[PDB]
Amino acid sequence: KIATTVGEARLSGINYRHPDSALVSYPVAAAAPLGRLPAGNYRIAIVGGGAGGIAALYELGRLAATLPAGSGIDVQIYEADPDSFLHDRAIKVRGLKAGRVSAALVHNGDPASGDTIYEVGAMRFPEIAGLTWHYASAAFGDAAPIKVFPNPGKVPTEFVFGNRVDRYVGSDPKDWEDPDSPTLKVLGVVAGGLVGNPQGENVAMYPIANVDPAKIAAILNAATPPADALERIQTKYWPEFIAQYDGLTLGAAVREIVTVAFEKGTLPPVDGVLDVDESISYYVELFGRFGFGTGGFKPLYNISLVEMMRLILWDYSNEYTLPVTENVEFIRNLFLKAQNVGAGKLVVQVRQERVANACHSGTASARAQLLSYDSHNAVHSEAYDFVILAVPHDQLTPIVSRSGFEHAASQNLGDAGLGLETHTYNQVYPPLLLSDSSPAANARIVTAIGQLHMARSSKVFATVKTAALDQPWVPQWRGEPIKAVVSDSGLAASYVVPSPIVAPEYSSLLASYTWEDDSTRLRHDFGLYPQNPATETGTADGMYRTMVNRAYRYVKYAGASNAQPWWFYQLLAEARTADRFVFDWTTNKTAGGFKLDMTGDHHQSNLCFRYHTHALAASLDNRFFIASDSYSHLGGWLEGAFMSALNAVAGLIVRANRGDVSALSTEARPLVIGLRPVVKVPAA
Amino acid sequence: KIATTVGEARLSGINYRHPDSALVSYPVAAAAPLGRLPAGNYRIAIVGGGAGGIAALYELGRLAATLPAGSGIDVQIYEADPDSFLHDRAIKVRGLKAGRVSAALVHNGDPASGDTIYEVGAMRFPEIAGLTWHYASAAFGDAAPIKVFPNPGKVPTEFVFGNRVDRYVGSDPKDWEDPDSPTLKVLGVVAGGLVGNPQGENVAMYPIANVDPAKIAAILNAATPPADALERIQTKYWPEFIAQYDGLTLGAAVREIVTVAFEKGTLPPVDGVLDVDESISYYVELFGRFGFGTGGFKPLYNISLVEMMRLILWDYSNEYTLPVTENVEFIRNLFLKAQNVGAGKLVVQVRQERVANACHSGTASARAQLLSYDSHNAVHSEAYDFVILAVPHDQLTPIVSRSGFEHAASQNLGDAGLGLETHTYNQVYPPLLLSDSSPAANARIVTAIGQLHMARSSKVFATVKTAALDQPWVPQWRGEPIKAVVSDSGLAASYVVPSPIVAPEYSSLLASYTWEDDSTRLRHDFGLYPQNPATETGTADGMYRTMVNRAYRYVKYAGASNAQPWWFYQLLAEARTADRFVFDWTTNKTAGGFKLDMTGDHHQSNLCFRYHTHALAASLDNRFFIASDSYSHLGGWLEGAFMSALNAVAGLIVRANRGDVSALSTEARPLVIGLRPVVKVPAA
Ligand SMILES: Cc1cc2nc3c(=O)[nH]c(=O)nc-3n(C[C@H](O)[C@H](O)[C@H](O)COP(=O)(O)OP(=O)(O)OC[C@H]3O[C@@H](n4cnc5c(N)ncnc54)[C@H](O)[C@@H]3O)c2cc1C
């Protein structure tokens, strides 16, 4: 039941509604332009040219094409990253980034004839990521081919935790080297306890609406559900799940599930010899390293159960590639499509400038101010009708948090501590303006943004001949070499990905893709930050040798007399010397890879997700919207950035229409009215 | 009531027992040598010359002095840090480190006449840290003066969160600028809920033995508790607390407490406009930035409630300085005292070598093997009777996890991925040998160690004239300048500490002391890792300007209508150009600052804490002990390192006596027998 084209994936997920936005299918809302604007010549800024900002630009283009003769939209897009595709009309990165969609091209002097691509950020896309595939269809067409991402379990995989080794494909014991594996048994216990059954008895530990999550996922994905059922999920049942479980970590939930299974006898004592608590702990940690289909979630054990449950409902692990050589092409293509679809009514200019501050000021028609610095640190100020702040939360904080929380007669804004020039604004209000009369409302949005959790992440890459997989010491599953390795060696998750520039001579050896503490533990060895090599011609050889050295472990396989050094050490050492690489998102200006919510974080992230509803408060007249995966319930997915972009543009339309929701299309209106408003007073 | 000398502190905490070791006061155990050894000439290694390793050395010296004529102990102490005090027998660090006890001396060319000291690691010591003050008396005498550490609230303090500003000293509202402050109300709610009352009614939300923690704290600190009370805590009531609450984060607990208080009306809606969950979240986040006496615990919100409760029971925030110019002096003095107390029966040699591997091997008497590399990267192998591994968990992992989990005929150990020379060992068993028959048992200890959580931390320092505090632009409160700033600016916690080289002309401006995500958010700006400057003659000016710039915020105060840039911006910018500094523990080889347990981590950390009980199994030939704050229930405190060292030496005594617990002193026996054993052996 594997999808083979963009269109097949698109249609698969077209219906799916996430539990915090259960009254709308975002793909359906995005099918037609989101609404209508009054006649005018608008001046809009988008800060950030990543997935969020470019999707927002695309939707603005669609709106622009609907405007009457004499009307139009001008967009200034600010993009600070010198490597952005926006500024481009051995390891090469220049022109190959669109924020956290980021490719590194490995070549030997001629970039048009490369060896492989490292996908440094986004790489694998859920089947039911309906908005993702909607935009992929706009970019590439429905007919374009897609492939199954080679996740652990999708290709032959070796798993190592402590003394346990497994070699497997999927979850059918017939496809496991050891069909009696305790790993496969604990997977069944934890999946049963978290997901349960779509039919029959409820067996999950943490019900939603008194039933297993699998049953709720089928309603959220229904090709037609009760409207009433969706409303009750939105307003009652998902909120009640949050109230109960937002304070429970994933790690705690796994331990509860394993404890009950152990007490029932479904899981036996480990070795026959560990005591009760040691056995439970062993299983918790074993599952921790194994995961849900994308490698161990041990490093993610501090996320709320609520956050994990979003991913469960979404069947997140069932993922595909894009029909591209480099994922940045998706975003580049959407940028071009935006301009095409505006039909001449959208004009776009790119600024290679870092925004330092946003505010509302003055008494002119355009009051939405941006203060920015160019690549030689010259200051620039511009006023706009509307602004979309399409940057993740730690990048947004300095822009929105340094102006205070209420009216100020005058402020000299900018990066004065850097020695840079400031600019005087008069009659100043915060950019994220939730009240004329509460500094606390203005402070709540800013403080929430600034305390969202950016998960840490890093990727270590090298280039290897694909034929290295045919060495006699590389294990096989039914004649196919092992191509994914999930391990407690410190590397966490490793992938031998065939080059997309093509059977390819080379593969991208994703030696280590780490999250959270797994990333922290490596970071001292990266050498140069955020990228080693920092130059096009260097190689991160010393760093990479420390990764090879982590793999230099004696591994015992069942039936063998003695342990020998792990074969995967030999595989890593087969990578060529040149083009060894690490990128540390943690030491990038993003301050990490992507948002993941901790216990208690729902209320912070959800405030951000609902922020665009400020447009309902007509007199407030707030001109700023936010658009990033940080302002979604899908941090770490293009789907989240795209949802947030859709929210931002929907809100912008309502604000341009002075609070009138009838300006949104029928299908888009629930983007605004299906959420609890962020402004209680005034109503609207 | 305030302790004024080492002896007064020592005596204050002499009886205190931690809840995971409730049967024993470690200082009482340590009052005499821990036990006796058979006659012999012992060859022992200590890996690591930090607080754990040196306290272990001291206790081995105490033991050595008791040996008869012709007997003795030889210790090889391995210390890889080139800046260790052990290898020394503008910003200078050479010779000023004892692991995470780490000083930076600021001077102008003559290091004998410095300006100030930056305490880069340990700096503030709880009054009831009884073992810390026990060793401080060994090093300095009881008469040595100590000072109250200038924590937020101990000195005039400014607190900033969102739109909220407070200026205060203490918890008496008479000395808050706003006695009606919401910050003081939430603090009182969160204290009632977590700590409760030492007398009368129980009001706390999370009881221990059905009573408030404050009541249990008193029992744990009592010279003579009631009969059976400590046993019941140890075996019943504290285990039951863990079973209930080890799956609950601190942040979740705070929100539960706040929710109940908001529903009761103790905490009002924040604005005329914040809804229920918004007001609740505001108070949770307000308290999160304020803290318990040492700055905001928001970054620590993912710790288990169990871990916070340990700190509550210990009154952890009531802290002092040591009687030194640099805290490294404490560890240096202890090292010299170890040699003195050995009475010529302890011989110590220091090796400037990095240990790469430990194992048991061969057939000779001394079977505990260490493989190391010197400063020329030449390999060394040495065999010992016993080894104490006195390094934190991420540094221990490569040493103990790469030899598998059962017998191997031979292994070529070492850092082969680095291209370094290996050494062949024959008849090899893992170093952390919990079982002769169960790889899973051996895997549980290794995998536990490798998955402990090392909290991230960083410190930004500069040098400022103390007289800067007397400028009209620095606020005064209750007769003194503000000297502590706790803020949501990104800096987290800031201190203006008078120089200890002396009123002093200079102060150490600890501009930012961050934990966890607060540290992550800054890390991209550090420039050089782990230390900027990397040289003695440089200054981290560019880095520091990014911190000054985070302080360039317009702050509205009650006392002035026109908000201005935060005064603290001016103070930070008053620091001199030279000697600006950051140290990032996260990018140090420790991979962070210190252990803090997440939900579920009790089972891992407590396994480590109990590991030395392997000595009870006489048939098990395990020569290795561990000694670090990572293997304690006080990660982030010298007390934890010292407790773990006491455990290690107690276990070593029992192992050297082939399982005979009677070889421990009466007072030290419970260090082994008061814990659940990690190996099953017969009763009594
Ligand atoms: C390691 C990693 C793995 C991932 N895995 C997947 C995956 O497999 N599948 C998936 O769907 N998603 C994945 N993601 C998530 C995906 O990459 C993001 O959700 C998405 O790219 C974020 O888009 P955004 O617009 O929110 O932010 P960003 O991509 O961060 O874009 C923001 C843009 O704003 C610019 N900018 C920032 N601050 C300023 C400023 N002050 N002035 C001007 N310009 C500024 C930046 O330079 C950047 O181009 C992954 C990401 C990472 C890092």
Ligand SMILES: Cc1cc2nc3c(=O)[nH]c(=O)nc-3n(C[C@H](O)[C@H](O)[C@H](O)COP(=O)(O)OP(=O)(O)OC[C@H]3O[C@@H](n4cnc5c(N)ncnc54)[C@H](O)[C@@H]3O)c2cc1C
């Ligand atoms: C930012 C920070 C703040 C802190 N605040 C306080 C505080 O105010 N009060 C308090 O009581 N405590 C505090 N602590 C905690 C205190 O510093 C530690 O508990 C204690 O110093 C840890 O001692 P240790 O022996 O466990 O480990 P370490 O200090 O880490 O010492 C281990 C030693 O082993 C060496 N080593 C490591 N690996 C090898 C190897 N392979 N071969 C050879 N040598 C090796 C290291 O170089 C090091 O010298 C703080 C620590 C930090 C970092």
Ligand code: MET
């Ligand atoms: C949020 S899940 C982790 C990040 C990313 N979506 C991945 O699959 O790697």
Ligand code: MET
């Ligand atoms: C564990 S609490 C945090 C580290 C250290 N004890 C401090 O007081 O800063």
